[PDB]
Structure 1
Amino acid sequence: DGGFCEVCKKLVGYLDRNLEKNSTKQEILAALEKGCSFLPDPYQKQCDQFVAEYEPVLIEILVEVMDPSFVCLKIGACPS
């Protein structure tokens, strides 16, 4: 239903900017645990929920691609 689309693009964007493209799954899991704290406060709890719900698919995809619009489309967070 796209309810996490905007927060997905913001948190994957944080990672896209701040993680190397070469990153290990362990490196991405650690970044996912910290990423929501870097978003504006109104997104904080939504981002925590998003990351907990999508963590498995996020780790699988982010080792291959970190573009926010693509990642969020591919995992279903942004249905377009």
Structure 2
Amino acid sequence: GGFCEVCKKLVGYLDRNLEKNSTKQEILAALEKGCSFLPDPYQKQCDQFVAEYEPVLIEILVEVLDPSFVCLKIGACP
């Protein structure tokens, strides 16, 4: 559960700032810039999270951007 809070912040950033019909390629590009917009204390943790969860993130985010649900389903929030 160490990545739960950062997961919800990052998915929250995507939910708010990315248009909803986005392609996997567009989600990937946004994911790999998103960490820089979180509060500074989360930056390196966010980078680590994206690195470790990026495949599963793309597969789920193309379907749904709800932070709570996404973070639960990928296993970041238990």
Measured against aligned partners, the alpha-carbon deviations of 1:27-58 in whole angstroms (never above 9, x if no partner) come to 00000010000000000000000000000000
**What's the % identity of the aligned pairs?**
99
Tell me the equivalent position of 1:60: 59
Superposed structure 1 runs of 4+ greater than 6 Å apart = none
Q: How many residues align?
A: 78
Q: TM-score, normalised by structure 1?
A: 0.96
Measured against aligned partners, the alpha-carbon deviations of 1:4-33 in whole angstroms (never above 9, x if no partner) come to 000000000000001111010000000001
Gaps of 5+ in 1: none
Distance 2:36 2:6 in 1: 12
Distance 2:49 2:61 in 1: 15
Gaps of 5+ in 2: none
Q: How does 1:1-80 map to 2 (within 5 A)?
A: 2-79=1-78
Q: TM-score, normalised by structure 2?
A: 0.99
Q: Alpha carbon RMSD of aligned pairs, Å?
A: 0.4
